[PDB]
């Protein structure tokens, strides 16, 4: 109930770095006129009579975290001085910054899930959680349920692939918008989190050979006279590479038929007379030959195998 | 050695938010009777004679981070007042909270490793590391060396798949227990970390068609008389889909034999007489026919191919 | 402009834990001689006349975060005492520590991307960001563009596989050097981040059977006289397992030829006369037999299939 018989004077004074110029930092009281001197005198403006001390130049933890001042009191006769230390406290006045605002990269569509796609780095000059950077994916373009599941970002700024890519069935391109925030702190005596400007990552997906070729038509038939000579054109078939970022050349072969030898095919899909034809032998089978054509890409697929497709063609003898 | 000739009076007072009601917050001293007035007067109780100031209502950084008070001194004749600011300091008095305590989801058993399975979010109202949420997987049920390797959790609350699933060979279901803690702070002047209540994630694994069918028996044989007519039942074989979450229908065909044509098989696994049989032709081969039966699932597997199995069957002619 | 008519005396004093022994902690002033007493008296050394109080024993937040002292003033006649609390503030004076400096583990080369390879844990005794551990991969040996893309580390200390392994085509071994730092704090009034001693993780990659066997030579031919008897050696071919961590045994079979039956091959690669040979029948085909040899590993590959390779061999009859 009875008050302490002493007070306590620290050798230091602690100011927050967001203390505005012209605010009162503190009052000097005795225990006459007061002053502040020495190389850091210009941080303060002292009222010599009242002891009122205002901040006269901005504080900044990032450059001058602490400094000394000399305080003086005078009774007219003698000036007594003491040194005082100023601790400047950090506040969340810096943002996370990246060195560029746009990035680009290419990735293979077979990139495995859990692979790092690209890494960004933002730095924030504050200390503590005010300096501790987190990353966020804000938007993915094109925006589909699937594009928003495709990529994810880690605390270190690495973007990881989270689902499988497809140049031909999903998208050849993505643009990700990101930001970086700090993990919060204080500014003007209340919570404050700072965020970066938006940044963009352009991703090109590279088409790899893993889709088989497809014939242009579900049906092909044609007719040929029974006396047609060796090498007569009958018809052209076409199959094309489903990997549209590749469009590998296709070749063809006759893999099977009713009447082996009667027809063959060139690399360019043209089916020709390759033997003596005979309308009379086909009177049982509707005067018709059925022929299986196989289309094969020139290069092997990603698994080191042939990329092929096949189908049957009907040909009318006369 | 000689003491400073001044003291220093700040314009503010800093209290921790866990200061208990009724504790002494501070003493007012001159430089008579003291008072506290203005809209925030009820935070304090002042002893007018001694200057003792107790906290009279709870402090709470989360709602009132700072506020002003008016302090007054009186000598009987005149009342002098000054404003004083109260900075309330954050302490770790909040826990990480999730919006529900149980979650459920389904995933395909072919989900690739490094995929996100499910994401939870906990929030903690404190600021700084006291507010910074970390996640933990506490338990996995069923508990095996393998179930505890299967899933892992990231700092953002995403549960990532770390090993491969199997509906049929591992488990159709998992239940994960999690918690969220903050990254520590101070409460009553010592370190304090806060944790959430337990939360649970129920995972259903979806069976996908990637296991071939299996015959019920390692051996099948039967007997048939040599004069048995076209279509006589001989025996039933059975193969079933190993994907037990699917149980796809199976069909059968005779893929090979000694004596092509003598036997065939129906979709329901029944092997029948499909030709004239002749005991005398088999006197060299133990009066026996061997037959290869192939079972094929009706739907294609995940890789777009036939799910098949085969075996040989012995049949005794008379 | 006119100074406040009171000062404010807190019941506590706050010191940073890096306050050096022998520095002035504070001055006691009245409101005669001063003293400090009670069980924690030895933390301070008081000048009884001047009120100068120096720190007399090291402060340490990690063991004694706060403690009480009794301060006394005497006028000769009576001694008045009050208790004062000392709050010790945490500073970043501890480093992240791991329990060992070297670790080792083995992983299968088919380990999927996004799998955890190994986990380390460092702990740092400080509180707040000064206690919050981050991990870094400093070096990978051997150092190639590819080895530095292979592994990545998460905030929880798990090393994740980021690209595909190969015992035979990349490396059977890696050594990773890591460190752990805290997330910064203050020491002697300025920012300070602490780092661990280096730690090493030795990774053995286990060779799995997923590469086919390869013949030693691109060409083999030999000669045999036309009257050579049943079982005469002609030549030895050799194929070996490309999985050099395995070196599975290989067997051979003749998969095809011009003149079926004339030659066969043993498990040890030796090709022998297996029929009556006849130089005269081969006068059209350059007195030569061409033979396809297939080499097959004894064990199935990781996908449950045969690991095979084939080639043609020419054999001169006389
Ligand atoms: Ca600043
Ligand atoms: Ca910041
Ligand atoms: Ca700052
Ligand atoms: Ca492709
Ligand atoms: Ca293709
Ligand atoms: Ca609170
Ligand atoms: Ca908290
Ligand atoms: Ca709080
Ligand atoms: Ca399955
Ligand atoms: Ca199946
Ligand atoms: Ca310490
Ligand atoms: Ca530390
Ligand atoms: Ca410490
Ligand atoms: Ca291998
Ligand atoms: Ca092999
Ligand atoms: Cl990850």
UniProtKB/Swiss-Prot annotation, chains A, B, C:
Coiled-coil residues: none
Subcellular localization: Apical cell membrane; Cell projection, Microvillus membrane; Cell junction
Stretches assigned to the Cadherin domain: 13-98, 99-215, 216-318
Subunit-level organization: Part of the IMAC/intermicrovillar adhesion complex/intermicrovillar tip-link complex composed of ANKS4B, MYO7B, USH1C, CDHR2 and CDHR5. Interacts with MAST2. Interacts (via cytoplasmic domain) with USH1C and MYO7B; required for proper localization of CDHR2 to microvilli tips and its function in brush border differentiation.
Domain characteristics, as noted in the entry: The cadherin 1 domain is required for binding to CDHR5.
Function of the protein: Intermicrovillar adhesion molecule that forms, via its extracellular domain, calcium-dependent heterophilic complexes with CDHR5 on adjacent microvilli. Thereby, controls the packing of microvilli at the apical membrane of epithelial cells. Through its cytoplasmic domain, interacts with microvillus cytoplasmic proteins to form the intermicrovillar adhesion complex/IMAC. This complex plays a central role in microvilli and epithelial brush border differentiation. May also play a role in cell-cell adhesion and contact inhibition in epithelial cells.
Name of this chain's protein: Cadherin-related family member 2
Lineage: Eukaryota, Metazoa, Chordata, Craniata, Vertebrata
Gene (name only): Cdhr2
Residues of the full protein shown: 21 to 344 of 1308
């Amino acid at each position: 109930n009875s008050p302490p018989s002493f007070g306590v004077n620290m050798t230091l004074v602690t100011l927050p770095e967001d203390l505005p110029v012209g605010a009162v930092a503190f009052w000097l009281v005795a225990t006459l006129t007061y002053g502040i001197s020495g190389p850091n005198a210009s941080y303060f403006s002292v009222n010599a009579n009242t002891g009122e001390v205002k901040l006269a130049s901005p504080l900044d933890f990032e450059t001058v975290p602490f400094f000394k001042i000399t305080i003086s009191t005078s009774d007219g006769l003698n000036i007594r001085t003491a040194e005082m230390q100023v601790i400047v406290e950090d506040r969340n006045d810096n943002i996370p910054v990246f060195l560029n605002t746009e990035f680009s990269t290419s990735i293979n569509e077979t990139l495995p899930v859990g692979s790092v796609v690209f890494s960004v780095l933002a730095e924030d000059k504050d200390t503590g959680t005010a300096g501790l950077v987190q990353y966020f994916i804000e938007k993915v373009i094109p925006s589909t349920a699937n594009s928003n599941n495709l990529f994810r970002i880690l605390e270190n700024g690495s973007i990881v692939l989270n689902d499988t890519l497809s140049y031909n069935n999903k998208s050849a391109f993505y643009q990700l918008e990101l930001k970086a925030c700090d993990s919060g702190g204080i500014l003007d005596n209340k919570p404050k989190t700072q965020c970066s400007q938006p940044v963009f990552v352009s991703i090109s997906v590279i088409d790899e050979p893993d889709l088989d070729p497809r014939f242009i038509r579900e049906f092909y038939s044609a007719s040929v006279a029974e006396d047609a000579t060796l090498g007569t054109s009958v018809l052209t078939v076409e199959a094309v590479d489903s990997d549209k970022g590749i469009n590998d050349i296709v070749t063809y072969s006759v893999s099977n038929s009713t009447r082996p030898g009667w027809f063959d095919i060139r690399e360019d899909g043209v089916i020709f007379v390759n033997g003596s034809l005979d309308r009379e032998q086909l009177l049982l089978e509707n005067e018709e030959v059925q022929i299986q054509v196989t289309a094969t890409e020139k290069n092997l697929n990603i698994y080191g195998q042939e990329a092929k497709a096949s189908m049957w063609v009907t040909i009318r003898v006369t």
